[PDB]
């Protein structure tokens, strides 16, 4: 059961929260201070921007630290306009009880560099309420992340 | 809370509506009259088809004009079979209150051209009810689009 | 309306079920015995693994046979860590009433091979309840699939 815009203000910790980011049933997460492009970490705050080269993917830290209640799933989709620019998001579930800045994979499938300003809206997260609190809210190894978090699989 | 097939007929404006497109909990949007492949706009109605070249993406206008109620989110996924053909969709949220034909990004990640007939089913949109109407239903710059709509970000 | 972890045990047929796969609001489907990489079928059980070459996609059979009730939609997302590794999932809806092992497209958008063990968690499926049973629960040509199922579109 999806949180409308007005329930998102009341019911999702979004820091820092941006009014222009609030969408009818979701929130435009913004480009944060960290990215990972071509094997290199980017200070997107310093550089002012992340540039996703043609046919490369970036890992982009959300500016927003997102804290989910134990009964809410974060469902993320690329901003339409980045899709229209050839960018594919590869997003995971934002598990109930998640707390942290999100590390987001965007793949520039186009032949043109795709540039995002620091603090630019790029992923709309929507919020699905669970039928009741998750028995085991998120306690995975990315919890509390405030930095670009790479794969811990290996 | 997801609309089953029977609630989709009653509760989503789908024009033109196709019975073969109605799925158990979603609707197979079909390939419309416009596409954008390799920097060029395609009259998919005229050509009869869009061909997504190996390792390229296309912007495909939906044949269907979709109008969402203010309490329903459009949640889009590639048809399974296009996924099985190497095609990746990059879809945005279809925001509550959306009205228009959808511009959809499909990336042919395969090495074989992926061809879609005009009017062929290619994206199943599912419909999530919001907990209550969005306070600010969709009023973004793509509203009412009846044509391939490119990125307005810049 | 999303099934929390505890409702997934009670309300989704998952065979074989793995406790480490159960997530706060979803289940980590695991890499099954079949894959399709570079035009070739892989016995992932025999090989012990599937290797997705740089910039290629694989079709991966889920280890789990998943049976959905007629009022539940399967909503699939890549494991976060595979996203962080440059992998893009292209998933369809898991339609209500689905019964079978899922054929999943993962695209390695990275320049490094992405390897998955047989039985390794790779896609978290979440379960959205429909507002009521689908009138026509899934009866498509992939129903009952227990093998990698390719595109039947043509």
Structure description:
- The PDB classes it as metal binding protein.
- Keywords: A thermostable enzyme dUTPase P45, metal binding protein.
- The assembly is trimeric.
- A thermostable enzyme dUTPase P45.
- Chains A, B, C are dCTP deaminase.
- Organism of A, B, C: Pyrococcus furiosus DSM 3638.
- Three copies of one chain form a homotrimer.
- Helices cover 10% and strands 45% of the residues of chain A.
- By secondary structure, the first copy, chain A, is mostly beta strands.
- Chain A has one domain: Deoxyuridine 5'-Triphosphate Nucleotidohydrolase, Chain A.
- In chain A, strands 1, 2, 3, 4, 6, 7, 8, 9 and 11 form a nine-stranded antiparallel beta sheet that branches.
- In chain A, β2 (22-23) and β3 (26-37) form a beta hairpin.
- Chain A is globular and about 45 Å long.
- The N and C termini of chain A lie far apart (35 Å).
- Chains in contact: A-B, A-C, B-C.
- The A-C interface holds A 1, 56-57, 59, 70-71, 73, 75, 88, 90-93, 95-97, 103-105, 107, 128-138, 142, 149-153 and C 1-7, 22-26, 75, 77-89, 109-110, 124, 126, 128-129.
């Amino acid at each position: 059961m999806l949180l409308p815009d007005w329930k998102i203000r009341k019911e999702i910790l979004i820091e820092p929260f941006s009014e222009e980011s609030l969408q009818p049933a979701g929130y435009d997460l913004r480009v944060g201070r960290e990215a990972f492009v071509k094997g290199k970490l980017i200070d997107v705050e310093k550089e002012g921007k992340v540039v996703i080269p043609p046919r490369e993917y970036a890992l982009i830290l959300t500016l927003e630290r997102i804290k989910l209640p134990d009964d809410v799933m974060g469902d993320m989709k690329i901003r339409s306009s980045l899709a229209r620019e050839g960018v594919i998001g590869s997003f995971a579930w934002v598990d109930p009880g998640w707390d942290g800045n999100l590390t987001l994979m965007l793949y520039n499938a186009s032949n043109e560099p795709v540039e995002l300003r620091y603090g630019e809206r790029f992923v709309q997260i929507a919020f699905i309420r669970l039928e009741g609190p998750a028995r085991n809210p998120y306690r995975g190894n990315y919890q509390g992340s405030t930095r670009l978090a790479f794969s811990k699989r290996k």
